[PDB]
């Protein structure tokens, strides 16, 4: 298995309840704990109206502690500008200056309810494997399912799943 630079792009919008946001934080911490001491290195970005890199690859290498790296997170509680968020990750997070490895396979785990308050395209992230981990009552809506298909890698059956069981992520370990 080659190196993998993985970015958790998590939804901090008002549409997700406080308990759901906390479940997102706990989920990211758990996935990182299971991937400690592997070819994986991480970064996390919270998105709502704006985007915030909560910790970068260099932070992960130095701390190697998910709990410590995400403890400071404050719920944004604004809009859900997902298109811009994916672009921000593609150009502002996957950078050697922030600890990214040029040789590494780029992976994005987008934890959200699937809604989007913005538009555009994500051509800049065409070389990034994108998973959608759903949470929130809006996830199963027709609007969300149609929206998330524009973000998830194909086929959707392999890259889209729910937070409670995260079945689609188990392949990251094989």
């Amino acid at each position: 298995m080659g190196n993998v630079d993985l970015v958790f792009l998590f939804d901090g919008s008002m549409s997700l309840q406080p308990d759901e946001f906390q479940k997102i934080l706990d989920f990211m911490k758990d996935v990182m704990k299971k991937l400690s001491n592997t070819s994986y290195q991480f970064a996390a970005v919270q998105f709502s109206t704006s985007y915030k890199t909560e910790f970068d690859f260099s932070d992960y290498v130095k701390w190697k502690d998910p709990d410590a790296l995400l403890k400071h997170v404050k719920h944004m509680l604004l809009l859900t500008n997902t298109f811009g968020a994916i672009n921000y990750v593609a150009t502002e997070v996957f950078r050697e200056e922030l600890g990214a490895r040029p040789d590494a396979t780029k992976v994005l785990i987008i934890i959200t309810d699937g809604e989007a308050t913005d538009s555009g395209n994500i051509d800049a992230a065409k070389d990034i494997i994108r998973y959608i981990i759903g949470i929130g009552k809006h996830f199963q809506t027709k609007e969300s399912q149609e929206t998330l298909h524009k973000f998830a890698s194909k086929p959707a059956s392999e890259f889209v799943c729910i937070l409670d069981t995260f079945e689609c992520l188990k392949d990251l370990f094989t």
Partner: protein
């Protein structure tokens, strides 16, 4: 250039926990994509030029909502704090 996004009703105070009709509108010429940001169950029930109306159901507690739309390529937002008393 610079317009406002109205959220009606503004900061409503209701009881029980049924439904609420929210209308997000703007006078911005050729506005694009009106969206309502809320953790409540929502259904788009009506729309016209510069506005969109939604029906929010299962309003059991206080909840803040935000509306957005693109005016002249820029995103503007409106808010409304829903208060529920029992």
């Amino acid at each position: 250039q610079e317009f406002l996004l109205r959220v009606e009703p503004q900061n409503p105070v209701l009881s029980a926990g049924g439904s609420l009709f929210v209308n997000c509108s703007t006078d911005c010429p050729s506005s694009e994509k009106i969206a309502l940001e809320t953790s409540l169950s929502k259904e788009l029930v009506a729309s016209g030029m510069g506005w969109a109306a939604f029906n929010l159901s299962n309003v059991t507690g206080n909840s803040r909502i935000l509306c957005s739309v693109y005016c002249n390529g820029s995103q503007i937002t409106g808010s409304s704090n829903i208060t529920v008393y029992g």
